[PDB]
Amino acid sequence: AEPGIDKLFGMVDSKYRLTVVVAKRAQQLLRHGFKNTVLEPEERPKMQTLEGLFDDPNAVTWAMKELLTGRLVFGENLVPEDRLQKEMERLYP
Amino acid sequence: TSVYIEDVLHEFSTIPGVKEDVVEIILNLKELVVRFLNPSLQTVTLLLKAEGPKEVKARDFLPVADVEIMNPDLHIATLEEGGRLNMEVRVDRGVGYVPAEKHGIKDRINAIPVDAVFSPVRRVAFQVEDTRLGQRTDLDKLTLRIWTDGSVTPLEALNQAVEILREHLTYFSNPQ
Amino acid sequence: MEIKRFGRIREVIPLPPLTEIQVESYRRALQADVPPEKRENVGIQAAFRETFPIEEGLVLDFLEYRLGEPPFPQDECREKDLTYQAPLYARLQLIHKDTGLIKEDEVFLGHIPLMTEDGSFIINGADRVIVSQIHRSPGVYFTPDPARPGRYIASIIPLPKRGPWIDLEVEPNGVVSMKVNKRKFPLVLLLRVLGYDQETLARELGAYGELVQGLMDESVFAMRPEEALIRLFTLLRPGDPPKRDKAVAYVYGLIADPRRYDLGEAGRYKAEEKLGIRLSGRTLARFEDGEFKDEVFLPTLRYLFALTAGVPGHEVDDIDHLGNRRIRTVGELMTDQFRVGLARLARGVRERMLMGSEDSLTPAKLVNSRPLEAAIREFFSRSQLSQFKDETNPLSSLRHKRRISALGPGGLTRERAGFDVRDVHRTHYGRICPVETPEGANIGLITSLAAYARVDELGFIRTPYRRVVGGVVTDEVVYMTATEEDRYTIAQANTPLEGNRIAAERVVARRKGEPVIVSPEEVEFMDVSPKQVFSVNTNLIPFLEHDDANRALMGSNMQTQAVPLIRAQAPVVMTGLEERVVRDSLAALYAEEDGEVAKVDGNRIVVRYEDGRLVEYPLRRFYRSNQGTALDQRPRVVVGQRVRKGDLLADGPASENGFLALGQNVLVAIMPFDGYNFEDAIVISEELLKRDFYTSIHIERYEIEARDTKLGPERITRDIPHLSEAALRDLDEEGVVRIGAEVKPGDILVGRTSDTSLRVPPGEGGIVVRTVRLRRGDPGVELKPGVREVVRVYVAQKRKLQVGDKLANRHGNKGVVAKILPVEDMPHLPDGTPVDVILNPLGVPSRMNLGQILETHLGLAGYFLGQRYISPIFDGAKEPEIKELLAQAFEVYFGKRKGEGFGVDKREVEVLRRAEKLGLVTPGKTPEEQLKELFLQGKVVLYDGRTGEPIEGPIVVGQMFIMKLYHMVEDKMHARSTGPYSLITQQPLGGKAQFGGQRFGEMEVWALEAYGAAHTLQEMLTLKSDDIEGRNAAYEAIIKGEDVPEPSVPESFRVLVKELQALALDVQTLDEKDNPVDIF
Amino acid sequence: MKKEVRKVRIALASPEKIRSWSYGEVEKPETINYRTLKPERDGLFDERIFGPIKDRRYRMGHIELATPAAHIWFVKDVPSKIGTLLDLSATE
């Protein structure tokens, strides 16, 4: 199965919630550059023959791992709509 | 490894004056066994071609000094009258089994490869009988009986394997 | 190798020509072998006498018929898509009412196909088959009333399809009814039309049936003789003049309607036998002298008042009863269609007399092949009856060559009313193999004929039966009719015998289709053999007696889907029919007579017969099978060798030494592996793939024709509008690809122009073997219109069993091939020799088919004893005898171990140790004996090979016979991602360089909907299909490493909006709060 | 404020609106001239009433019929949408 999938379902008020959350953060990780992570120090995802999976492995694979830690916060109306790609593109190259 | 017949295009054909069809002979070929006498003989190719009524024996081949054929009686084919027997027998000394469509040997433009039939081992078996000497009866007496096509004798095969083993045992050196 | 058969029953008369069903049927049908001197009748000739005597004055009759000069030889027709027919001439003369003229000029009308040595036909370049059909022999039959348990109802049905369906229903309210064309009427009326008068009627009629007053009622109408007819017509719905237009009536005279079947059996049977007696005429005819005589109406009713009253002999005919069910062999079917063309031919000659220009015409003026030829060509190529000759292998064709079905012309059996005929009836006994029916739908509707069972003068499949006087068995036998059979008491062939007399007193026998126990005194007959009970297709199973009819049915058909493996191997166990099979099947060729071998060339065989003569035989090297396979002939003889008449010259596609060999007898060690043999999974040792055990030859016929469009005819040539040379190399000739070339997926074989070159379709092709073209100067080929020329490309390759391979056993155990573990870590026998195939025991219980378990054991001895066995169906070997020989084998396996200087192994100890704790071996005995006693059970010690640690508990081993099936992995391997699109709609269809992604169907979607995969779903309905925008948009993002495009609006959305706008529909897209929403 | 769609309206289209979403009216059954693969003026494929054929199936036009016609649907449909509207013999 998938990593602490259970711990995830317990963080969301609905199964389907998780999905939409995992997908949205997954994109923001690649589009807005791959340096928006929050667990980059240690225990960061790795590869095989070359543990180069420290930069660009798989979107979601990272998204969930991020939720693994209560570092992020989610909700229905947390941050203003448009104020999304505005504060993100300017903070990250 | 591969063969090329003069009067042939595909392995699914047949030559006049020739009893057995292509595939039939080709099969009787892999059934052949040869012996090299030097680590250099990595690639050898023989040739043979007789005519008129006669039993096409593997022995009829043209001796090639070093390499020897331990399979004389091998009845490869037979020619009726004026059988245009002409071929190109590529022989190699690889290891194990190898798909004829995996290597793709092209000695000649219209030559068709074959499959690997190395491993000079027919069948092996080990017997772990009781003990014979020692004040203890809970001992063993291993005894293995092997069979080889002809290339390498039991001993040969024996040492080799045992060695491959030894060498492998060293890989467990540099930890992590 | 040694050959031991356990035949206890003295199989008297050998198996008849398994193909005589089609053979003679065509022969007798068209009497051509012997001159018109040997005036037979039935079939062709009879067809003439029928609609030949034409008189409108037009007076032309039949004289002599001859022909049979096949334009081109066999093969020619195949490769040239030609039709194997035969010029049909005809000799006839004309005589006028004005004495004179005798114009008899050879008049021919179209050609007719012919039956191949094997019993097939070559219509248009392809070999087809004329399957037989069943039905209810057009006769008189009485069966109970529909939903009314009251009385009963009579029925008369004289085919061909042009025979009115007359019925006799006893209307209780009064009077009898006669159903015809959906209308009932007082039979009395008709009777009067026949001359039956009130007095003479009643008296000799209802003398016993007081119910007679139900027809002797007419005292107003039945008082007018001939006048009755006038009235009868009034019944006919049409409003035609009451004149002498006695048409419809005369129709049921002596012409066509009443079956014109043989005057003695075909019709007389259902006559004399059931009711009435003699058959005046050929049917209820006689329209001479104005009046009409029908010794048919009297009886049909005389039998009616009979059952509805006393007991003249309980006449309540049964439906399914074969003793009233006729068959339609090739001859009948063909001759039938023939009569059609004849009637259609006579159609003209008649009209070509009214407009005839006096006595200045006779041959051409009255003849025209048009009608005749047309019919014939319709039957042999447009009738559902004729089919694609299933040549998956020798056996396959043979079965499809003698199969039978109900469905057909329609006037016999339909499709939505037969759950009754589908089930095996009592009469099917030895007439129709109960386990020969196909799978899936239509099951039962189609099922081949039994074994020895053969057709008679008119369908009715008879069967052999042993005569017996008291307790003595007669060596004589006769084919009894499904009817007369019940008349006697037949006993089984199991019944112990002492030379020529019965054994025990309590003998088993079948009375009237019912299993009963009778004494050696009432023994009227006895079964000829267990064989005649089932058809060949099944008579090939090892120990049928140990498998369910259900699972047997499987293995039965499975053999038909077998593939002609290169290294043929006759089953370790044989039913003894393999020799006969390959013979009547014509898979191999036998020497015509005794003599000596001459030329033993790989392509030609020559021999010099003792009767002072010499003949050669064409050796079809590698012919393209109808199902794409090998069809070679391996010469099993050598130069100069005294041969006997009918000796094995060259082997058939799947034959070996005169013995059928559809597969191989590989070593098997039935036992559960690392799950690799889960459901039906089948493991396998690389060892087999090494010595090219399981492998076959496949071919692919890709054809290409040079069309002739009005936009510039297409030309065949190396001219490629894309200056590609890296592909023109192999394309040596001016268009065609070189012979012996290695074409690969995508390369070109032939070059078309207007560049429509025929490339190598997806998957593979193999190595070309032979190709031929057809220019304009047609040496004698029927080049289709609009075609300038045509070309064929015969490509092929080897089928080396891999992973997706599937193979089953003669017992019906099918299964795919999972992993193929190498001989290295393959479970081996204590003394080397590893195993070959590992079957999972779990597939033995639920599937009650112990037969295999038997063949294995039997085979386990054949390996050491070095021999093969032949076990009759039910007379096969028995448990005792086996253990005897098997034991003998032990003295060979272990017998040598002794003298060599070695005893048991420490491993063999631990195993036997648990053997005793498993009650397998008798404790207290010596290891030696323990292993022996255990060997007799068919189980032996077995080492892992992977770990060397033998598996605790013997593992039953032996040589089971398996085989690969037609279904390969080639026809399945669709791997698409980016390719073509539907020129019409917008679907990823491939076909050329790429492939086409499987459909999705609403079903799959639903499930997808369930999951809630909104996007995954929306992705499949758009980005991966219709909306081409998002498709490419997506391709870019992907190749660019950017998130896939999120379709804002599927092309289907906006297109429909306006699509509706196009017609009124003011489709207005509002937002969340009743507000406009920009669509584009 | 480009809130996704949630509502779909279906109603009769007024002649006025007919021209509304119309960008030009073809008034000649001239599909495409045979001399030039280019459409014939105000034909069924004009590049002005619909648009460019290169770098067009999202723009509609109309045919102002001389004398008013009728949308068979509102007359032939089982319940004479209009016939029953004016009591007239719904089908006759």
mmCIF file of C-alpha atoms in Angstrom, chain C residues 16 72 101 104 176 195 234 280 454 516 631 755 833 836 848 853 921 1003 1078:
data_model
loop_
_atom_site.group_PDB
_atom_site.id
_atom_site.type_symbol
_atom_site.label_atom_id
_atom_site.label_comp_id
_atom_site.label_asym_id
_atom_site.label_seq_id
_atom_site.Cartn_x
_atom_site.Cartn_y
_atom_site.Cartn_z
ATOM 1 C CA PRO C 16 -16.329 -47.369 -41.931
ATOM 2 C CA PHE C 72 -8.021 -26.314 -64.101
ATOM 3 C CA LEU C 101 -38.252 -32.774 -85.969
ATOM 4 C CA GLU C 104 -30.969 -32.818 -80.261
ATOM 5 C CA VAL C 176 -62.813 -31.532 -37.595
ATOM 6 C CA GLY C 195 -65.324 -38.242 -54.233
ATOM 7 C CA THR C 234 -64.618 -19.786 -52.066
ATOM 8 C CA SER C 280 -50.786 -44.427 -54.680
ATOM 9 C CA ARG C 454 -23.958 -44.015 -40.764
ATOM 10 C CA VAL C 516 -33.020 -52.956 -17.787
ATOM 11 C CA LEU C 631 1.236 -28.775 -43.837
ATOM 12 C CA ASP C 755 2.120 5.818 -52.354
ATOM 13 C CA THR C 833 16.459 -36.445 -14.810
ATOM 14 C CA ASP C 836 9.431 -31.094 -17.426
ATOM 15 C CA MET C 848 -13.810 -34.686 -11.946
ATOM 16 C CA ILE C 853 -4.169 -39.223 -13.314
ATOM 17 C CA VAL C 921 3.916 -47.089 3.088
ATOM 18 C CA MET C 1003 -19.743 -0.256 -18.265
ATOM 19 C CA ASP C 1078 -19.210 33.012 -22.338
#
